[PDB]
Design a protein around this ligand. Structure first.
Ligand SMILES: Cc1cc(CO)c2cccc(NC(=O)CCC3CCNCC3)c2n1
Lengths: 156, 39
């Protein structure tokens, strides 16, 4: 079906009404989303079918129709935009300066913007419009607010 | 059964709403892909 580059809503008719479970990025004929949104299940695009190609529960990422294409990274210095696609609401760009998730295997960028669970998979972009990662996997901080990682894959 | 619907272009927008702080957190990532706070 529709293979045009852009941001897309991931919907399901299994629950009550049409429920938005997540968001994804279409780039170079490849659909990119978080693993916890689809659980690796196939996707429909009108009458066309999208089958999974690569996935990893630890990274919490999955690609459809081909290998992971998104390879831009946060420069560790500048502000970014969360192109938030919330359930039932219009796509909206929000500008923030990312924080840091310090782990035992290195530092990861983090965005402190709180959005509904169905916003998971919304892309985070740099000043050139390049996708530097996806929003939707993070933690609940000492304040109760949500802080998501800037989750990026590896382009083989 | 899941399906996709277009929601827009991936473009940087000049004069977008600027919000959100930049915290530095000590975190752990487990085998199930779940992040947790290390203290
Ligand atoms: C508690 C909470 C609240 C909010 C909003 O306020 C969330 C928004 C987006 C996304 C979330 N989930 C996650 O960050 C975890 C996803 C997966 C779980 C199992 N597999 C590994 C990641 C939110 N979790």
């Amino acid at each position: 079906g529709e293979t045009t580059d852009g941001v897309y809503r991931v919907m399901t008719r299994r629950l009550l009404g049409s429920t938005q479970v997540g968001v994804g990025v279409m780039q170079e004929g490849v659909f990119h989303t978080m693993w916890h949104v689809t659980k690796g299940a196939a996707l429909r695009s009108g009458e066309g079918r999208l089958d999974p190609y690569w996935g990893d529960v630890k990274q919490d990422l999955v690609s459809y129709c081909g290998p992971w294409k998104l390879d831009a990274a946060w420069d560790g210095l500048s502000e970014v935009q969360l192109l938030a696609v919330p359930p039932g609401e219009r796509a909206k760009n929000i500008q923030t300066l990312p924080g840091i998730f310090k782990t035992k295997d290195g530092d990861i960028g983090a965005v402190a913007l709180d959005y509904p669970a169905g916003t998971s998979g919304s892309p985070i972009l740099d000043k050139c419009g390049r996708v530097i990662g996806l929003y939707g996997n993070g933690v609940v901080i000492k304040n109760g607010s949500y802080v998501s990682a800037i989750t990026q894959g590896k382009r083989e | 059964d899941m399906y996709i619907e277009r929601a827009g272009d991936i473009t940087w927008e000049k004069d977008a709403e600027v919000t959100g702080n930049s915290p530095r957190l000590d975190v752990a990532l487990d085998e199930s892909g779940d992040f947790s706070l290390v203290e």
